[PDB]
Design an enzyme around this catalytic site. Sequence first.
Site, mmCIF file in Angstrom:
data_model
loop_
_atom_site.group_PDB
_atom_site.id
_atom_site.type_symbol
_atom_site.label_atom_id
_atom_site.label_comp_id
_atom_site.label_asym_id
_atom_site.label_seq_id
_atom_site.Cartn_x
_atom_site.Cartn_y
_atom_site.Cartn_z
ATOM 1 N N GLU A 36 -14.302 -12.451 -6.993
ATOM 2 C CA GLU A 36 -13.784 -11.374 -6.132
ATOM 3 C C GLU A 36 -14.580 -10.090 -6.362
ATOM 4 O O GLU A 36 -14.832 -9.373 -5.405
ATOM 5 C CB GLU A 36 -12.246 -11.202 -6.237
ATOM 6 C CG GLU A 36 -11.540 -12.367 -5.511
ATOM 7 C CD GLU A 36 -10.020 -12.381 -5.495
ATOM 8 O OE1 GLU A 36 -9.383 -11.580 -6.166
ATOM 9 O OE2 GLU A 36 -9.475 -13.267 -4.796
ATOM 10 N N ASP B 231 -2.261 11.620 14.742
ATOM 11 C CA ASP B 231 -2.335 12.286 16.032
ATOM 12 C C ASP B 231 -3.619 13.085 16.146
ATOM 13 O O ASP B 231 -4.309 13.390 15.157
ATOM 14 C CB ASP B 231 -1.081 13.130 16.303
ATOM 15 C CG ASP B 231 -0.920 14.245 15.323
ATOM 16 O OD1 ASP B 231 -1.723 15.196 15.400
ATOM 17 O OD2 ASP B 231 0.044 14.170 14.539
#
Lengths: 719, 719
Positions: free
Chosen positions: A605, A525
Amino acid sequence: AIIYNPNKKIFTLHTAHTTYQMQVDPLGYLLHLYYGEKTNSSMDYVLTYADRGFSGNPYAAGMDRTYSLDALPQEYPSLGTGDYRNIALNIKNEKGVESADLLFKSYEIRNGKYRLQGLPAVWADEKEAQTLEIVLADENAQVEVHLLYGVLEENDVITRSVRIKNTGTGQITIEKAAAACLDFVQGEFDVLRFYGKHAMERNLERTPLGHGTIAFGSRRGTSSHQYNPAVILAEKGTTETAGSCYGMLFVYSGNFSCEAEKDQFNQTRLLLGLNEELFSYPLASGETFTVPEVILSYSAEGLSALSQQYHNCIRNHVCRSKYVHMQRPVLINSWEAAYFDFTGDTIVDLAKEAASLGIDMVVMDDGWFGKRNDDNSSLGDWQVNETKLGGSLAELITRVHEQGMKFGIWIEPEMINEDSDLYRAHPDWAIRIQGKKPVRSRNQLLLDFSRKEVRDCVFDQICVVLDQGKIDYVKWDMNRSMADVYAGNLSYDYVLGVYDFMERLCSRYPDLLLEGCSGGGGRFDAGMLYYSPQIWCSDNTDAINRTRIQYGTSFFYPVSAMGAHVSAVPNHQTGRVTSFHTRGVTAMAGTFGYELNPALLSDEEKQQIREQIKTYKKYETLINEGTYWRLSDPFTDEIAAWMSVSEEQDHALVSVVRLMAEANQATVYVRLRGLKPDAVYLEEQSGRQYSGAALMHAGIPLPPFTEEYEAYQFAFTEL
Amino acid sequence: AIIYNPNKKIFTLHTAHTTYQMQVDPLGYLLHLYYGEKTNSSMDYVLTYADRGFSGNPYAAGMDRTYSLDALPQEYPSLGTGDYRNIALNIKNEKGVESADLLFKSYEIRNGKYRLQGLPAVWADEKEAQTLEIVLADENAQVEVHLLYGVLEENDVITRSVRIKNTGTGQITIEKAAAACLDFVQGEFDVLRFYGKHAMERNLERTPLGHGTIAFGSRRGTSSHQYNPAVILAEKGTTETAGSCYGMLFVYSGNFSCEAEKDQFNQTRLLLGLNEELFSYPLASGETFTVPEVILSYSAEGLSALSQQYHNCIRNHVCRSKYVHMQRPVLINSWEAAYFDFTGDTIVDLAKEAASLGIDMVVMDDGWFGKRNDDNSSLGDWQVNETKLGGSLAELITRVHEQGMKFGIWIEPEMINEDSDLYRAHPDWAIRIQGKKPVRSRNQLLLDFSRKEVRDCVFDQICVVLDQGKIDYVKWDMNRSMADVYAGNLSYDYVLGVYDFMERLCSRYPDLLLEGCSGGGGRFDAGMLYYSPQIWCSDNTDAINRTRIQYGTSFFYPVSAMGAHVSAVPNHQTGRVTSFHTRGVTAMAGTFGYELNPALLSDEEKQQIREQIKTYKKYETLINEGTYWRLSDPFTDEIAAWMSVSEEQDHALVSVVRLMAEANQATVYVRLRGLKPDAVYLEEQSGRQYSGAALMHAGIPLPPFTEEYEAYQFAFTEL
Ligand SMILES: [Mg+2]
Ligand SMILES: [Mg+2]
Ligand SMILES: [Mg+2]
Ligand SMILES: [Mg+2]
């Protein structure tokens, strides 16, 4: 701009492209006239009056049956006016009477942007903003209500807040207090809200507003995973790129309620503010209460522009962190990598591994304090576990620095476990009801942050830890909802206490990057974003689910605020496998970072990590500061696609994750947005050139996929 | 603008705001690249190629399985390429083989706008338009196909036609010939079509395009009441005021077929042109056949702009009548007023009545010729019934002129009754199949207008009638569909004959106002509007139904083209009663006029007629030349509302008819469109002033109704 016409008693608020207008009527009521496209007209002509059965009349209307606050549009409707709709304000007075019937007293227009006592709020300078403060009162309730409107012209934002003062001698209670109300005399609307659960936040739900109310809220003590304190009221037919839509966003990290109602006369009322549940807030004689702020905005040209207005407001007028305008270290976080099973040595190994890949920072997550070897003890005991760390925290930080790495740490200051020294010493510091065994969640309890003594104890402990060395980053988590609420002031005062601690922390450590967290995005928020430039978006780090979570989060919140990390597969939350490349593309729509042990990865990776970091750093300014566009809806479409565009529209990064796979695949095109139609753009990897018009109308064909959930990034540069 | 890039073999057509692009590929096929927003890019990058199972390959593609006309987008796809979708062209060659496989031969770009042999078509000057003619051929079919593209830049219109030539020695037949094809490689669309019945034409049907075909057409020998030869392909989400949409409009008054298909690869193909049913058109060696024209247009900003583009094209580049730019006499028509029960004296009484009210013209409708005292005799016997008229037609016209009134007359030249002198003399002139008793409809038969001898007989009779006096107006009706079709050339050649007669008539009588008619709007098409500036919109003169019919008609056709009259109540078609004022407001959205006996009206209704005529004449230029806006959808909304706005946006007339009534009425607002946002407008009757922005965003509240189906007109003038 803010204008008062004294003769018509009309207040007009103008932004660059919008106008909001209100009027004090002849009885003293503050009516809402208009909010929409910019106009110099007096919009009082929209008000109409009829004798409507059972819609009754203030005594002051005399014999005029056509005047009713059960029909008329209002800035701040209340329980006690004869209005029977959902209302913004309910006061229970010093005699037990629930009534507030508010009449105009005075106003002031001021340059600049008001601030709120003990609360986050939008901020701006005296040239960028103006404030209107209107005072209304009810002499029988003995309440005085100050409505605050903040106008940020360039951003097309209007903020609203409220201060409520008890002007009588006896105590009153505030029983409901919204921050904002929009009353529409006409229009067919849909309500967009963002619902979910732990590890799957902010799914978009869009439905027509039928007769009755669509409502949602939180009484969890937090803004919540379940319903974000945000709403879009979209006119029927509004799309990403056309049509009227209205936002309300609550700058608040506690309880809330949102109500949208289509009434008996086909009018719409939209409310956002505090929850009326577990909210009976005492106000002594002469005291003032402040309702947290709502940020309103309007777009005439669709949802994407509305979101962009919010993104800009949040980045430039809510977030106070220096990291809004700075590179942020690419971090690796120990949580999915090791959970509680680590030592100081394995943190340094993680630093070594990460340093060799171009990672900037290691974050030691939960498990470093007390005897926290699982989640069943030690919250409240914020002493370093030097046995586990194989030495002091100061020494560990130095060892990490010696690997060329910055250091971050996790805290959860609001919480306590029964199995802690703190709880054995102070069991009454937990939020509980006397005589009642409390709800447990993650086998822990909340500390009563409404109490200074409690906060001070924990704040001092955290300061000791942060003072041991150069800690550039703190992740402040919060892993359960509030229960056993013992009084009607607690939910609000708890959050005041959280903000007080957070303000003290940020003031003491102004160079600290504070990442907010609450089991992921449980307090995602604008209240938190005032303190933190990023919030851990979700504990779900599954790339495919993250496409939805990040999509939903983007309706109000900027990409820069979304904590997002590349994690291991099979994913720890879903069991799904995704390619390393797809995880990388998805996590770059946010903070970026890693949350895995790179020692377990293949050399291929590891090399992807090196290239990912180079890519993110190359595009970091564009991703964080650029104009964001949703290019697809991952709930319905074949792809999750988005893009960021520089302010000058001379650079763009387009990201695509495929969501569906079948044989004999159809060609899928990604249509771009936000470019200059007549400009020519070079696509970097391919070297092909396209006009903006072409890219926005036809788009570009995606390369055919050969595996599931394939992802793409395309970069465009204006020639 | 029309451009050829010889290296890429790309043809680009630019209008003011749109671009259409095509390419000759390396095998010679004419592929469609793009149609949409204006771009200077080469859009050939949108083409993709894959080996798609069962989508096969021209022999000339060799071993390349990725090249298939069953997948690729094409300008003019045909039966005989390996394409399995709906196709535009089917030729049956001189050996019985149905195949056409068309390869590029040559092109020409010319200034100006092509014309079509024996057919109406869009026209323009050499500065306003350019023409592209592309020649394709199939050496095995021995056919040569000339594709014609007309580009009208300012109007954002692209027209298409086709000429097909037999280059072999034996006869071929043309079995299917579309005028236009749009192939979309991507997009989700809705199909808008305009369906109905006699006395309820052109209802809007809008549905998503699912997999498969949505098709409609006419084999009635006419464009028809049932399905208008018009289609809108709207991108999903397109509204009146936003989003992409594409039109095709057939400039043709005969048979047609429209097909929209969403295929196996999620591509869309849209076709419009001749019906393949009852169409097997013979073409001898060296002969050419012309397919009637389609007017294409594109809007990026919704359906209202698309319609406006069509309105302007039709008014300024289709209609050739001088009355496009002149006042048109307000007429009264005898049909609903008297049906067949009139004399010359009662026509003069109607003239007297009408003159006293400000009406300009009396139209003597059906019943004046032969022994036409009902609809069971006399079509083909176009001799004045001087017994019924109480004297000659010349004398009647003079008597009407002496009342200060102009004169008009009804004809139905394409038809014959068995009970006629003409049929007793020439029964073989009726369309029929030898040995078969024919379908009768309204107890009449079609004359074979493919035959010059038949047309000449009727044309001569009509000339004798029109030469008796000053007849300023003719209503040319046509009251049944074609049946007993005896050969595969008949449907097409019949319509050539109709157009030949119509051209001869208009050339002989260039000051004549010709109103087209076919049981109302049974041939409401741009082919007829080339000759007639107005067409009787429907036999339904019920004001409430007319709101829907006129709404639907407005999607392609200008208000000025819609014949509309105030008629009596209870309405003769529905039995419904409406106020005289509501009938007036609704009929002013068109030609205006009356079709009742005013002697039966009250003095108050006679005074309404006087005021209605003054109102229509005051606003005639605005209604006819102004920009039209649909302000509501009468299928769903509380009101039928529309408005016309001057070119300078300094004047507007808003019309509203209420459709729904309940107690305790909610306030209904009409939101305006097409005004200048910052301009101030004065509403005439009330004297109130509003900004354009206010009027478009909030609109104006309608006065509360006190009776059913109430109507309103509001006039606005820029200050
Ligand atoms: Mg309460
Ligand atoms: Mg509630
Ligand atoms: Mg055929
Ligand atoms: Mg067919």
